[PDB]
């Protein structure tokens, strides 16, 4: 096998890949948005697919939950499969008083409570930073689609079930717009390979007000987010 | 749903759960070793099953790759599903000069480069420590099966594709016997809930000398480890 | 005085301010590019000025050397003087193999060896992140002017006379384009006040290859950068 | 002298050494439980002795207070004097809601607020872990003596007179059973030399409820603990 | 220029240099206390001057605000300009209960929230320590002038506009007498060059009780402090 | 007992105490330099004595090896025994190129690899600083005795058997004059109690050149150091 975690052969992935944590959502994206679609990985149930969107080759694959999981899959995609661009497409919480459930968030950079980026930069602060062409393509696609967006910082945590007092209030004070678990691991790997990455998320929950998106609102926001991401790939 | 990541209802998991990272391997264990197994979760493809082993209820479920992933699943099992004992079963690398491929490693405690345990203990050193009854049950089960074991420390890294110079040499100097990615996240969660956890792994690679277990040898030592864990559950 | 370090009365700064380390360079910018210009600060020699550029109010003020210095001046501008946008303009070194002396760098985010951002976010990684609209205005201005630019990460150090082995190689490995001393301190303050910041630098020295820009090249570089910034203010 | 802190000559220590913090207690142990005891060290008043227990060679020596002190003496014992097994014996506090004054605690691993173990493992989490054969020999000895035991984690602090808010509550949340000052420094040195170590302590104080053992209870607890340790040496 | 930040030529600075944060205050000291004074630098407005005090050559120069700023100017002074002694002269706040506005503080050592000294000593605690001969010269000069002094620790912060809860209370508990922003950056640079540094400050503000010095009191305080420092140079 | 580690009654210790690591050396100091001496502690063999030097009550006591040990004894002396001044009288290695074996070192401040002082000051740099009246009494006593001294920084390590590369070279670069194991823990405790501490050490070894004091040199330097300390007590 080409890697321990992926049965695809080199060339099976397109130069652009959308990734989400849930492999079953990767399948939904392929089934509903890709033509000419082929399954190219099923190791560990981490479904990956390659097809076309409006004529342009594009892949979609799950990445599992957390920085260590996406780090395995994205390192392999850049190094072995010679992918050029990964766009994470996910869901998030927010703490920002002016971000609301249903909102689409385009991520410019992501903080974290992980040690993985300190280990890359001699213990210093290494900002996990989205590629500007990717951010711009997402922003411009949303505008062309008449979809409002929030643009700004995410925070990637190792612990879904947080017990940390003061954190939410500090993230709100500095207007972090998205809380999730992966993007801070993706961007430095893109950098290491001289490649590109970005992230776009829909707000499922407001962590401070406790408001939560209905299933119908989650469908609406998913439809918005995925169309933005797909249209962005045509410009990348 | 009972949790965001698991469709099982309260009561659908036995008090003892074996977990491995690969959900397809969890299905293999259920199919080949569990009697009257029922699938109880398939959210995110993270297959989980509940049946019996020699009369005694037992569950098996995937945990994904890395500390953040196993923390979600194990927190839920202990908190929502009222699980009492989780035994992780996996493969590992080793750096120890006296540990060899195909060896079976029983983990007493696990180091890590993750921040999750410092965050639990006011920034101090918190040893991720296996429960002694679980360790001893695994040790005694292997003795009963006349399967040699190595008993000692593991190291759980966040980064599969390590670029860290001098790490392997330090791990070998202090006789770490197993290198993997999850056990250091599991043991403190068990502690928080007053529950039990342990880990048993087979050596598929020597990181220093580069020996690697053939496909045939990996299947044999998997069968050894799993029988050890299954017989251990009868004592727990 | 309205603050301990600034003799300006409230309302004497425009909502958009350009800032550079050298107060004499801020004077040179007011003299050569602002009309209707008046000196508004002289405390500690940190000259600041307010006039118009192409009809629109604009200010320009020195910020001194280092994160603590720009933090003092920026905090006051956002808090006391109600400034909305700060664009830092300056010079930098580079370690990136594909960046060369005389290049113009637009900063999307900045790493650092300072502790100021960890202190804002409970010890965690807080990416010092430029405002996207500001980044975009600078990119678009350079395009209209047919000035090539590099867009990416900076690294803000406390120590001009570095003695640190391995830092330059790690910065180059992850494609940091600019090394300077202030921007990582500016962006989180803008965040705190719900305001906007960015940074644009010209490369004076390649830290690795040792190439270095002549004074004629350095004036040509400054003139391009400052035109890019001034034209961007018209769209902000 | 063979070491700067020990006048004994190589061969003067038995392969198994009991160590306690107070040298006067080491003398008490030698006088009351060892046969044919001889004093082999008195440098710095840190009395050490060698004799037999039930005819098996055994030594007993003081180690002084805290991680730096025990590190000096243990390092020398393993390296210069070729000792193979050290069992630390002493008293501890507890925070665990279900551990009580007079309880006997057998230590599986120890956390710490010391830096010494980070310095051994490139800044990462290195669990100070007792040797499993030593743990089991202590556990089994107590069973043969019909003495109940608590088996679990200790916490070794550098600061007896703690002023740290929230520490006890977090130690209790994660079921740390013993608070003392040395074991976290002993176990990694044993690892370095490919040797064995363990720790057994009796509870003198409940840190949270403030119960305290009377002088008479402390003597009784010590008698139970030292017999468990001595009998364990016969199995090692 | 001799350095990017100083146009002075080698030999233009005396062996002893007084430095303060505000360049205009440096000009005041030169005009009012130095005989035959010449300006030797004005790069970035950072005025420096060389003259004589009661016959002995003496310079005085601004160093800007914060550790990174003083680090540049002092590193150059010791290295390029071969200076032997720097005395920082400044204002400070205090949190000490027994220190009052108008007090004169002679600094023996300085704590900090900067990273710059950890980076010099492999991440460990490196006390920024004043030269004893300089401290002694200051104390004795004040005695000779019948001006009471306070002698003790300072704390150098990167953030003038502190939001940190608990800091002042801890500084008070351990009897830090002065809070400022530079001295902990100066002392280790003097160490690197085998040279001497000290600091003296007048209390302008009590951080805890909120007393503040009047215009008249600032004047007589600065006159007291400068006379102390100037007389001290005679013994150095 | 008055404390868990000291059988002295309150009042038994004079307001000034000399302390050294070796209790047998404490006894030598009392036997040879104190009149009217009586032993006041023997718990844990940590001998302490009170008598007079030149008519003035003075005590001398061992403190054991390492920051944790001296912290226990010093905290108790200030808090329970109402001691006002502690002078550590010790031996050290040096790394400084201009410091030689046999030299006497008066410590102005001490760095460390211990966490104890970060824990006192919210994780920041807390310089362990000697009290200026004690430093000055020691310096002036040596002058009065025509004994030359070195004055400057110590470094207190937790690990006698250091394996740390680059440490000695950094300490030498910044002209640390003494390497030992305790002073950094003593000075902050004095601060907490509003009390006084200092340290004076004899150089037994050059860590870099490997020179070592002969017996005769150690006697000469010991006699010098102790006479300095004793005379200084008369002025304190």
Gap positions in chain A, given as the residue before each gap (C–N > 2.5 A)?
none
Residue carrying structure tokens 């008043």: D45
- For C121, the closest of A118, A170, A184 (CB atoms) is A170
How far is Cα A59 from Cα D41, in angstroms, rounded to an integer? 72
Count of beta carbons in the 10 Å neighbourhood of residue C65: 26
For B119, the closest chain A residue by CA position comes to: A164
- Residue E10 belongs to some domain of the structure: no
How far is Cα D46 from Cα D23, in angstroms, rounded to an integer? 5
How many angstroms from the chain centroid is the CA of residue F225? 11
How many structural domains does chain B have? 1
Catalytic site residue E205? yes
- For B24, the closest of A44, A115, A157 (CB atoms) is A44
CA distance F9 to chain D (A): 19
How far is Cα D118 from Cα B113, in angstroms, rounded to an integer? 10
- Chain F CB contacts of D22 under 8 Å are 44-45
Residue D205 assigned ligand-binding role: yes
Residue B164 assigned ligand-binding role: no
- Chain B CB contacts of D135 under 8 Å are 132
Closest by alpha carbon to B153, among D125, D47, F140? Answer: D125
- For F109, the closest of E120, E129, E133 (CB atoms) is E129
Is any Cβ of chain F less than 8 angstroms from the Cβ of D68?
A: yes
A228 within 8 A of A104, measured Cβ to Cβ = yes
Resolution as reported, in Å = 1.8
CA distance B72 to chain A (A): 6
Size of interface A-B (CB pairs under 8 A): 108
Is any Cβ of chain B less than 8 angstroms from the Cβ of D203?
A: no
Q: Is the dihedral of CA A3, A4, A8, A12 positive or negative?
A: negative
Range of the domain at A198: 16-233
How far is Cα F104 from Cα C67, in angstroms, rounded to an integer? 41
- For C191, the closest of A128, A174, A184 (CB atoms) is A174
Size of interface D-F (CB pairs under 8 A): 107
- For B112, the closest of D112, D117, D125 (CB atoms) is D125
Catalytic residue positions of A, numbered: 205
E90 within 8 A of E112, measured Cβ to Cβ = no
Residue carrying structure tokens 């030269």: E131
> Exposed e or buried b for every residue in F182-192, given b needs 16+ CB within 10 A?
bbbbbbbbbbb
- Contact flag B109-D126 (C-beta cutoff 8 Å): no
How far is Cα E206 from Cα D23, in angstroms, rounded to an integer? 50
Count of beta carbons in the 10 Å neighbourhood of residue A208: 15
**For residue E33, what is the enclosing H or E element?**
helix E23-33
F165 within 8 A of F105, measured Cβ to Cβ = no
Chains sharing 3 or more CB pairs under 8 A with chain C: A, E
How far is Cα F20 from Cα F17, in angstroms, rounded to an integer? 10
- Contact flag D111-B127 (C-beta cutoff 8 Å): yes
> Exposed e or buried b for every residue in A70-84, given b needs 16+ CB within 10 A?
bbbbbbbbbeebebb
Q: Is the dihedral of CA E191, E193, E199, E205 positive or negative?
A: negative
- Residue F3 belongs to some domain of the structure: no
For A159, the closest chain B residue by CA position comes to: B68
Identify how many contiguous H helices and E strands chain C contains and give both numbers.
7, 10
E233 within 8 A of E138, measured Cβ to Cβ = no
CA distance D144 to chain F (A): 32
Chain A interface mutation, best of C107, C124, C140, C169, highest count of A Cβ atoms under 10 Å: C124
Count of beta carbons in the 10 Å neighbourhood of residue B212: 13
How far is Cα F138 from Cα F144, in angstroms, rounded to an integer? 10
- Residue A183 belongs to some domain of the structure: yes
- Residue D197 belongs to some domain of the structure: yes
Give contacts of E 126-165 with C, CB under 8 A: 157-161, 163-164
Is any Cβ of chain D less than 8 angstroms from the Cβ of B119?
A: no
- For F45, the closest of D23, D75, D181 (CB atoms) is D23
Count of beta carbons in the 10 Å neighbourhood of residue F144: 12
Q: 3-state DSSP call for residue F224?
A: helix
Residue D75 assigned ligand-binding role: no
Please state whether at least 3 CB pairs lie below 8 Å between chains A and C: yes
- Contact flag F135-E139 (C-beta cutoff 8 Å): no
- Contact flag C75-E114 (C-beta cutoff 8 Å): no
Burial class (CB in 10 A: 0-12, 13-18, 19+), B86: buried
Name the pairing type of β-strands A150-156 and A104-112.
parallel
Closest by alpha carbon to C138, among C200, C83, C188? Answer: C200
- Residue D2 belongs to some domain of the structure: no
Residue B181 assigned ligand-binding role: yes
* Residue E67: C-alpha distances to residues C158, E145, E156 (Å): 8, 31, 8
B203 within 8 A of B100, measured Cβ to Cβ = yes
Residue B1 assigned ligand-binding role: no
For residue F48, what are the contacts with CB-CB under 8 A and spacing of at least 6? Answer: F6, F8, F13, F23, F26, F39, F40, F41, F42, F59, F60, F61, F62
* Residue C50: C-alpha distances to residues A25, B176, C24, C72, C235 (Å): 54, 65, 15, 19, 18
Name the pairing type of β-strands C150-156 and C178-180.
parallel
- Residue F11 belongs to some domain of the structure: no
E38 within 8 A of E49, measured Cβ to Cβ = yes
- For F173, the closest of E109, E170, E192 (CB atoms) is E192
* Token duo for residue C153: 């990460």
Is any Cβ of chain A less than 8 angstroms from the Cβ of B24?
A: yes
Instruction: Return phi, psi of residue A164, to 5°.
Output: -95, 110
Q: Is the dihedral of CA B60, B65, B71, B72 positive or negative?
A: negative
Q: How many residues does chain B have?
A: 236
Tell me how the structure was determined: X-ray
- Contact flag C191-A175 (C-beta cutoff 8 Å): yes
Torsion over CA of C4, C5, C10 and C14, rounded to 10 degrees? Answer: -160
CA distance E158 to chain C (A): 5
* Residue F235: C-alpha distances to residues B228, F59, F141, F230 (Å): 74, 15, 9, 9
B63 within 8 A of B70, measured Cβ to Cβ = yes
Is any Cβ of chain C less than 8 angstroms from the Cβ of E218?
A: no
- Contact flag A159-B24 (C-beta cutoff 8 Å): no
Q: 3-state DSSP call for residue E157?
A: coil
* Token duo for residue D78: 């393993």
* Token duo for residue E100: 């009052």
Helix axis angle for C215-233 and C23-33, nearest 10°, is 60
Backbone φ/ψ region at D100: left (φ over 0), alpha (ψ -120 to 50), beta: beta
For C182, the closest chain E residue by CA position comes to: E68
Name the pairing type of β-strands A196-206 and B16-20.
unpaired
- Residue A49 belongs to some domain of the structure: yes
For A165, the closest chain B residue by CA position comes to: B119
DSSP state of F181: S
Q: 3-state DSSP call for residue B135?
A: helix
For D128, the closest chain B residue by CA position comes to: B127
Secondary structure of chain A in the HEC alphabet?
CCECCECCCCCCCCCEEEEECCHHHHHHHHHHHCEEEEEEECHHHCCEEEEEECCEEEEEEECCCCHHHHHHHHHHHHHCCCCCEEEEEEEEEECCCCCCCCCEEEEEEEEECCCHHHHHCCCCECCEECCHHHHHHHHHHHHHCCCCCEEEEEEECCCCCCCCCCHHHHHHHCCCCEEECCHHHHHHHHHHCCCEEEEEEEEEEECCCCCECCHHHHHHHHHHHHHHHHHHHCCC
Q: How many CA atoms lie within 13 A of C194 on its CB side?
A: 6
Backbone φ/ψ region at D112: left (φ over 0), alpha (ψ -120 to 50), beta: beta
- Chain C CB contacts of E116 under 8 Å are 158-159
CA distance A134 to chain B (A): 25
Q: How many residues does chain F have?
A: 236
Within chain C, residue ranges assigned H as helices are 23-33, 67-79, 116-120, 132-144, 167-173, 183-192, 215-233
CATH number for D169? 3.40.50.1580
- Contact flag E68-C71 (C-beta cutoff 8 Å): no
- Residue B170 belongs to some domain of the structure: yes
- Chain C CB contacts of E114 under 8 Å are 114-115, 158
- Chain D CB contacts of B111 under 8 Å are 121, 124-127
- Contact flag B64-A67 (C-beta cutoff 8 Å): no
Q: Is the dihedral of CA E222, E223, E224, E229 positive or negative?
A: positive
For residue C196, what are the contacts with CB-CB under 8 A and spacing of at least 6? Answer: C84, C85, C86, C131, C133, C134, C190, C236
Helix axis angle for C215-233 and C132-144, nearest 10°, is 120
- Chain E CB contacts of F151 under 8 Å are 132-133
């Amino acid at each position: 096998m080409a890697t321990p975690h992926n049965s695809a052969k080199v060339g099976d992935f397109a130069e652009t890949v959308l990734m989400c944590g849930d492999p079953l959502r990767a399948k939904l994206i392929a089934d509903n948005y890709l033509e000419n679609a082929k399954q190219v990985n099923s190791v560990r149930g981490m479904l990956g697919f390659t097809g076309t969107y409006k004529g342009k080759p594009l892949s979609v694959m799950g990445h599992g939950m957390g920085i260590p999981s996406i780090s395995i899959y994205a390192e392999e995609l850049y190094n072995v499969y010679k992918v050029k661009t990964i766009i994470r497409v996910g869901t998030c919480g927010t703490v920002d008083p002016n971000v609301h459930v249903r909102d689409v968030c385009i991520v410019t950079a992501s903080g974290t409570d992980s040690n993985v980026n300190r280990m890359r930069l001699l213990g210093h602060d290494f900002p996990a930073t989205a590629n500007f062409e990717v951010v711009s393509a997402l922003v411009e696609s949303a505008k062309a689609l008449n979809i409002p967006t929030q643009v700004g910082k995410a925070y990637s945590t190792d612990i879904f079930y947080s017990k940390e007092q003061g954190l939410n209030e500090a993230l709100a004070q500095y207007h972090f717009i998205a809380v999730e678990m992966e993007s801070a691991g993706l961007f430095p790997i893109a950098d290491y390979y001289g490649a590109r990455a970005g992230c776009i998320c829909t707000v499922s929950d407001h962590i401070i007000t406790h408001e939560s998106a209905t299933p119908e609102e989650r469908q609406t926001s998913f439809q918005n987010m995925i169309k933005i991401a797909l249209e962005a790939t045509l410009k990348l």
